[PDB]
Amino acid sequence: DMRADICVHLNRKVFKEHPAFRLASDGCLRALAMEFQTVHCAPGDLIYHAGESVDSLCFVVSGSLEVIQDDEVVAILGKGDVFGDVFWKEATLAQSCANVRALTYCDLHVIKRDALQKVLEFYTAFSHSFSRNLILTYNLRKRIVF
């Protein structure tokens, strides 16, 4: 049975690319891979709408996305970017201040706050290296002041 190990391999563009995972043990990566989901967007698809609860950490492996608050483009995300919220440092979930819309076909690999926190609480060594290394590309909770 190699189901888990196939899932680790399917997440390689996150696990082997993002510095936050350099210290993840194989067992740790297996536990994470079981919880990650790959999302496929078409151009124009909304990944997150303003007002929506930010409950997942999203890694862009492919494509481009625009972030928009108040009908203003505030950022552009691309491969290797990560957006969502700091669930390891934040007590409570909050509403999104911005829309995230796909500009092209995109692959996102996403993990829910709950499933992520569970892994972090076990593998505490990785969890501090993860925290220090995961810098959000966009924090959907923070509001840009124009």
Curated annotation (Swiss-Prot):
Changing V67 to A/L: Mildly increases the affinity for CALM. Detected in brain (at protein level). Highly expressed in olfactory bulb. Detected in brain cortex, hippocampus, brain stem, striatum, thalamus, hypothalamus and spinal cord. Changing E66 to A/R: Strongly shifts the voltage-dependent channel activation to much more depolarized membrane potentials. Disruption phenotype: No visible phenotype. Mice are viable and fertile, and have normal brain morphology. Likewise, there is no change in the electrophysiological properties of cerebellar Purkinje cells and in the shape and frequency of action potentials. It is found in: Cell membrane; Nucleus inner membrane; Cell projection, Dendrite; Cell projection, Axon. The segment S4 is probably the voltage-sensor and is characterized by a series of positively charged amino acids at every third position. Conformational changes of voltage-sensor are driven by an electric field generated by a potassium gradient across the membrane. The C-terminal region interacts with the cyclic nucleotide-binding domain and contributes to regulate channel gating. Pore-forming (alpha) subunit of a voltage-gated delayed rectifier potassium channel that mediates outward-rectifying potassium currents which, on depolarization, reaches a steady-state level and do not inactivate. The activation kinetics depend on the prepulse potential and external divalent cation concentration. With negative prepulses, the current activation is delayed and slowed down several fold, whereas more positive prepulses speed up activation. The time course of activation is biphasic with a fast and a slowly activating current component. Belongs to the potassium channel family. H (Eag) (TC 1.A.1.20) subfamily. Kv10.1/KCNH1 sub-subfamily. This is Voltage-gated delayed rectifier potassium channel KCNH1. It comes from Mus musculus (Mouse). The chain holds residues 562 to 707 of 989 of the full protein.
